[PDB]
Amino acid sequence: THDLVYHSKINTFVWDVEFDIVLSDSKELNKCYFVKCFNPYRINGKCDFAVSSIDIFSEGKRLLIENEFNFKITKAVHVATSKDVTEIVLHLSERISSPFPIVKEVVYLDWSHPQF
Amino acid sequence: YDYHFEVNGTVVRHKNKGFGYMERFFELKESCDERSKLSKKQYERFNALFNFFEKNGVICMAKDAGTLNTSIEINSLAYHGKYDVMKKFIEEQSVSIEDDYKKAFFLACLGRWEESYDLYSNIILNSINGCVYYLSQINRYRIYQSITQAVTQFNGLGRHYKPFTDEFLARIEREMTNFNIDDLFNGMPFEFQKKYKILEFLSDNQFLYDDTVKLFELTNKVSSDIVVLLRLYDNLRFLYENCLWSVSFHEFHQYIRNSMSLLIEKAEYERTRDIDELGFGFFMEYYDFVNISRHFKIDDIKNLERSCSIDKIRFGEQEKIEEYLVGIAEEITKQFSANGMNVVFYTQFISEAKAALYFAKYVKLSEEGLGKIVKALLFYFPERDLDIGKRYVWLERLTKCNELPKSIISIIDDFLVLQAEKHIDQNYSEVSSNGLYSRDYGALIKHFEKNFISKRLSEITLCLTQDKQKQIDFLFKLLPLLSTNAKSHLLSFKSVENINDLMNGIRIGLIDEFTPEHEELIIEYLETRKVNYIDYMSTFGIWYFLEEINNSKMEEFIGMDDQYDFFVDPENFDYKKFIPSWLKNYNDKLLGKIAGNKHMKHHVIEVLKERVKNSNDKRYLEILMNYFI
Amino acid sequence: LDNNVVECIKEITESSRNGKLVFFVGAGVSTLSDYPQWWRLVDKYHEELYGSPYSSDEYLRIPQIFYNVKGEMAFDGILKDFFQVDKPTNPIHDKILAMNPAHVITTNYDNLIDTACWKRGKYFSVISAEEDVANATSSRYLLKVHGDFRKGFKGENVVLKEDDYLNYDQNYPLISNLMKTIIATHTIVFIGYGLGDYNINMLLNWVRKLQKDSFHKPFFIRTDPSPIENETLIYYENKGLRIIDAASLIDSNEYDYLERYSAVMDLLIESQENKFITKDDEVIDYIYGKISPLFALQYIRKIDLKHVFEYDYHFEVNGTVVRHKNKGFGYMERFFELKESCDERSKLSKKQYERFNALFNFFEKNGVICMAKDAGTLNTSIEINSLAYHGKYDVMKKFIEEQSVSIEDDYKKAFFLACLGRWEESYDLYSNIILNSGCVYYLSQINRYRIYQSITQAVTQFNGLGLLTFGRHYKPFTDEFLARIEREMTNFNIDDLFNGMPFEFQKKYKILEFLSDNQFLYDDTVKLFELTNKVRSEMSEGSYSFGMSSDIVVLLRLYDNLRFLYENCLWSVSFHEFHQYIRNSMSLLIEKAEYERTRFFMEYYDFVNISRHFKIDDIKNLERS
C-alpha cells in the first residue's frame, strides 16, 4: 500500500489494483478496475445528481452498464506487486462508505474547465 | 568585467580603473559634433559599433537613462513557428556558409535531424574567425545527443518507428565516438579563445545554473520580476537568433518553465498581499504565450492554473497570439490531414500544439480563427494525444472568451455526424480518458443554443433500423439534437418495461420527464426492497427531493436507507445518521437545492462547520462557502 | 591478452583521457591508403640515372645522386609527377583521431592526416616548415617533421634525399626541438614504423642521451606480418620502447596489413571505456582511486558522487545507489557484495583489505548504504559536526586562541573567524593557508575570494547606509586593509581558479569545481522547484499518500548541503542564495507538515535552520499559512 493515495475531494482511494467481482446475477468478471472522473461543472440534465462519473474497465475495455451493478469483490490483486490485497479492499470499502471506494485513477475535470 | 551591461540596456562602470571608454563612446553617440573629429576609418568603425549596440539593445549609461523601452523582439523563424517559411528557406540554395548554419538549425527544428547533422558536418568541413565552425561543432554534438535520446525513447515507446536508419545511426556513432565537447573550445585557435570567450559556455553541460539560482528572488516575501523576465528574453533571443540547438533541450525548457511559473506566482502573491493591505501585475503578451505553449507541459499549465488566477492575468497582443494559434492549427492540419507526419518533428510539435490550444482559453479569437482552431482540434488532432474527452475539454475551454458562434456549432455538428458515421461499425467504441464522450459535444451545443436541431443526425436517425444497435444507443445520448420525427423514430427502439430499463433511460437521456407508470415502477421496486429488507434507493430519494417525482407515496419506505430518509423528508430526519461524505457526491444543482430548502440547512451547515474545524478539508470548506449548504 | 600488453593499453588509454597522448604516424599508415611508397621514387631515379633497376642507405643516396647530377628541376619534376595524387584516408587515420591525441607527429609528407583531421572535425596547427612553429595558431600541432608539399611539390620542402637527412638538424632546428619537447612532455605511440626505421633509431639514439628515468618510454605499435622475436623485443624494450605487436595479438595474412593495424587501433579505442576490472581487488583499487582524494574533505554530497564516478551511478540522498550509465562491470554492486559478505572480505589482498576498510568508513560516514534493490528500512539521523553551525561562539573563540597543529586547523580557524565577523583576520589566515599549501589550497582560495566579497559588500553598506542605520559611520576595516585586499583581488578570477590547477586536481576533485559559482546549488534548486510544484499540486487536489513523503528528498538534500558547506568550512554558508534555498526548503517542509497534520516535527536542526536562514517576514508568512 505504498502507491495507495487517498483522494479527499471525492472520498476515494486511487490504487493500482484489479478486481474479480460477482454481481447479483452470478456473472463473473476478471481483472477489472474502475476510473472516477470528478466533474463538478458537468452540464447536467434534470436527473443527474452525482458529482463524479465512474467507468468500469475489464480487460482494457470499458463496460456498458445495462443491469444493476450491485457487486461483491471476490479477489483484488495489486498489479505492481502481485500480492493479494482483497482484505484491505474490503476494509477500506467498509470504512469509506462511498460508491467504489478504490479506483484505478481519478480524473479531475475542475481545473481544466473554462469556469474554473 | 569593466562594466555591467544591465538587461534594460544601461551600462555601469564596474571594474576598470583606466579611461571610461564606454562613457566616451556614449558621449560620442549622443552628439554628432565630436564624431567628425574621428578619422574616416574611426568614423566607420564608430558607425559599426553604434549599429551593433543599438541592435543589441544597449542605449546609454544608467546615470543618463530616461524613458527606457524594453520590448522583446526575436528575429527567428524557428521561434515564431514559421514552418512553411523555414521549409522554403531550406529549399532555396544557400549563398553563404552562414545561411547553411541557419538551414541546419531550421532542419533541426523541423525534425529533420539527419539532414541537420549532415549539414552541420558539411559546415564544419567548409568552415576551417572560426565562429561558425565552433557553433557548428556545438550544434552537431547537440543534434547527435538529440538523435541518441530520440532513438532511446522510440525503442522505449504506440507503434515501433525507425526514423533514423541503422546505417546512419552507426555512422554517427562512429563519427562522434570519443568526442569531447569540453575539449572543443580549448582546441580552437588562441585568437578565437580570446575574441569569443563568451561562447565557451555553449560547450558546457549546463549553462542556465546561474539564471535558475537567481530565480529565488521571485520567492522572496518581504524590479526582480522585470530583471528575471528580461533575462529570460535575453536567453531566448541569444539561443534562437544565433540558431543554437540547446534551445530545444530539457534544461532550457525547465528553465523557461521555472522562470515563467515563479514570475506568475510572484505576481499573484503581490496581488493578494495588496488586496489584504489595500482592499481593492503580470501582463502577458505574444512572446509569453509562445514561451508557455512551447516549453510548458499540460501538467505545468495545470499547476499554473491551480496555483494562480490566470483569468486575472490579462492577455495582450491577442491578434499576434491568434495568428500563432492559427499557424499551429494549419500545421496540425498539414501534419495529419495529409501524409506529412514527421515522427521526430511530431514528438516535439504535438506538445507545443497541445499547450497552445490549452492556453488559448484565455485569448479572444476571431470567428474565422476560432473556426480554424476548432476544426483542426476536432478533426486533425491525433487521437493518441487528444482523445474524445481531452479534445472536448480543449474545445469547451475555447468558449470562455468566445461564446459559441454558429460556425463553431456547425463544426461541432460535423464532428458529431462523423462520430455517428464511425458507429456504423459495431466494433467501433469511443475511448475517453476523461469520461467525456460524444454526448458532451451535443450537450455543449444545446447549452449554447437551446434550440439547435442537427439535420444530418436526424437524417441518420430516420434511416436507422433495429440491426445496427450501436448507432441507436449512440444517437440516444444525442437525443436533444434530433428533430421531433427523429426523436419519435428513435424512441421506438427502447423499452421501459422494468426498473433497470428506466434507470438506463434516465442515464442515457432517453426520457427526462417522469411519467406515472415510471413512478409505479419505482414504487414496485421500493416495495420489493422493503419486503426483502428482512443502490437506487438514494437516487429515488434525491429525485423525490429534487421534485422529479410527485407521487407522494414514498414515505412508506423511510427507515432503510439513511440518505433516502434524509432526502424524502429532511424535517423528520435524525442527523446523527447523516454522513458528511454525502455532500462530496452531490453536484452544483443538488447542493444548491439542499441549501435553499429552509429545512436541513442548519444541520448540514453544522456538519460542514465541524468538518472544516476538525479536518481543514478544502472540499468541505468550498462546499460550505459556495452554496452555504 | 598478455599482462604487459594490457598495461600498455591502460597507459595509452589513461594518457588519451588526460589529453597527453601523442601519435607518431609513419609511412605504414599512408601506404595502407595506397599513397606512393618511396621505393618507387628510388626506382624511377635509378631508371633515369642508370639503365634499369636497394640498401637502406641507397634509398637516400640514389635520390641524392639524381639531384646532384640531373638537377633540382628534374628532381622536382619526378616528385611532382609521382606525389601529385589524391588518395582516401584510412579508417586507421580516423581511429587515431578518435583516440583524441594531443599532437600528431608524422614523417609523412602527404596530407592524408590533414584530410582526416579536416573530415573528422579536429583543428590542428599544421607545422611542416620552420616558420610554422612561431606562426602556429593553436597549442595542438600536426607536426610534419619531414615537411610536406603544401607550399609546393618541391624537393626543398621535404626531407627525401641523403643531404636532407644529414643536414636535418641544421635545416630544421625548431621542428626537431618541438618534436623532442613533445616526446619529453607527452605519451608517444609509434604507428606505421618498422622498428628498423631511420627515424625510430634516431629517436632511440636521442633517448639514450637522456637521464635514466627522466622520460616515459614511448609505445610502438608493431604491425609486421610475423610476431616479433623475443631477443629483438628485449633489445628494443631495453632501448626505451614498449612494443605492442599486432601479429602476436591476432592472426592474419602476411599482406593483410589493414587488419593488423585495425586490431591494435580498435583494441585501444574499445578500451577507452573499459576499466579492466575482473577481481574484487581491482574493484577495490578502482573505487579507492576514485574516492581517496575525497578523504581530504570532511563530507561529500551524495548528489556530487555521480560526478566522481562520471555518471556511472545515481547516488540517491537516501543512501541507495542505482545503475545509471555503467555499461561495464558493476564495481559498486561488487563493493556492496563485499561489504555484506564478511567471508569475501578475507579473499581480498593485504593492501586491498585496508583500502576496502577505508572505503567502507568513507561510505558509512557519508550515508551511502547499498544499491536500490537491496534497500531495507533506511533512516539516517542528521548530525552536522560543526561548531559554526551550532553557534558555539565561545568554543570557536577558544579554538582560534589555540595554536594550530596543522593546516586543517588553520582552515577551520579561518572559517570560524569568518563566522565570528573577524573578516580581516579570516582573510589574513586564508592568505597564510594559501602560502603554506591541493584541496586545502583551492578551498582557501574560494573562501578568501568569498570573504573578500563579503568585506566589499559590508564596506559598501557601512559607507552608504551604515552611518544612517547605526547613527554613526562605522569603519571596521581600515583603508589600508581595503586597498591591500583590492590590490590582491583586483586580477583574481574565481571562474578560472579551477582551470588553472594541476590536471590531477581537476580530475580527482571535479566536484569541487561547482563551489566557484552557484552551480553547486543548481541541482538542488531544480529539484526543490520540481518537488514544490508536485507537493503543492498534491495539496491543491486534496490527495494524501500513504508511505514515504514526497518532501523527504527536499529534507535530505537540504541536510546534504548544510553538512557539506559547514563541515567542509566553506563560506558559502553565508550566501544569500544558499539562505534562500534553505528558506524555501524549510518552508515547503513546514507547509507539507501542516497539510498532513489536519489529515514531520520540528527538531533542533530545523529550529536552527529557521532561525539562521529566515527573515522575520518569512516566519510571519509561515505563521499566517
Residue numbers in the entry:
A (entry chain C): 11 to 126
B (entry chain B): 336 to 463, 467 to 495, 501 to 565, 579 to 636, 644 to 897, 911 to 1005
C (entry chain A): 22 to 74, 79 to 462, 468 to 629, 645 to 670
What is written in the article reporting this PDB entry?
The recently identified bacterial Sir2 domain-containing protein, defense-associated sirtuin 2 (DSR2), recognizes the phage tail tube and depletes NAD+ to abort phage propagation, which is counteracted by the phage-encoded DSR anti-defense 1 (DSAD1), but their molecular mechanisms remain unclear. DSR2 contains an N-terminal Sir2 domain that serves as an NADase effector responsible for NAD+ hydrolysis, a C-terminal domain (CTD) that functions as a sensor for detecting invading phages (as discussed later), and a middle domain (MID) that connects the Sir2 effector and the CTD sensor. DSR2 forms a tetramer with its C-terminal sensor domains (CTDs) in two distinct conformations: CTDclosed or CTDopen. Monomeric, rather than oligomeric, tail tube proteins preferentially bind to CTDclosed and activate Sir2 for NAD+ hydrolysis.
The phage-encoded protein DSAD1 (DSR anti-defense 1) directly binds to and inhibit DSR2 activity. To elucidate the molecular mechanism underlying DSAD1-mediated DSR2 inhibition, we first purified the DSR2–DSAD1 complex, which showed no NADase activity, and then determined a cryo-EM structure of the DSR2–DSAD1 complex at a 2.5-Å resolution, in which approximately 60% density was observed, facilitating the accurate tracing of DSAD1 and CTD domains. A structural comparison using Dali search revealed that DSAD1 shares no structural similarity to reported protein structures. DSAD1 consists of eight β strands and one α helix between β7 and β8. Each DSAD1 binds to the CTDopen of protomers 2 and 4, with the binding pocket of DSAD1 located on the backside of where the tail tubes bind. When attempting to dock DSAD1 into CTDclosed of protomer 1, we observed a notable clash between DSAD1 and CTDclosed, supporting the idea that DSAD1 exhibits a preference for binding to CTDopen. Notably, in addition to the extensive interaction with CTDopen of protomers 2, the β1 strand of DSAD1 forms an anti-parallel β-strand interaction with the β strand from the MID domain of protomer 1. Superimposing the structures of apo DSR2 with either DSAD1-bound or tube-bound DSR2 revealed minimal conformational changes upon DSAD1 binding with an RMSD of 0.425 Å, but significant conformational changes in the CTD and MID domains upon phage tail tube binding with an RMSD of 2.419 Å.
